[PDB]
Peptidyl-prolyl cis-trans isomerase NIMA-interacting 1
Amino acid sequence: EPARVRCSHLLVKHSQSRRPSSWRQEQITRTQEEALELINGYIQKIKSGEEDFESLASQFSDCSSAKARGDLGAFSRGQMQKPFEDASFALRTGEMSGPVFTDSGIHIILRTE
Ligand SMILES: CC1=C(/C=C/C(C)=C/C=C/C(C)=C/C(=O)O)C(C)(C)CCC1
């Protein structure tokens, strides 16, 4: 296991997120169910080739990392929320997760280093 991984993500918040507000939307109103449907739709379009992960993240991620095309940079264990960390360190470079749930919302993660 490396000391640190670098990842990009796409976050979809919902109305029960810890902070239901984002750079792109003043109040998050979507339900948890709707957030997961959006995440699963993005996964399916990335798999078919219809959409590019980094483009989708720039446009639609509720994390301010959207401006960096979803890049979070490098991190070790003990920093991020545990489910995010566990998913990230389980990926190979170039691999993308399924849905990952944290107190922030629902994530897709792409490990880049
Ligand atoms: C995603 C994420 C985390 C926190 C996410 C949240 C809460 C992001 C906030 C974005 C906005 C946009 C907040 C706001 O506007 O209040 C940490 C690093 C702890 C664990 C995994 C990565």
About this structure: Residues 32-48 form the longest helix (17 residues). Strands lie at 5-12, 71-75, 100-101, 106-111. The first strand starts at residue 5 and ends at 12.
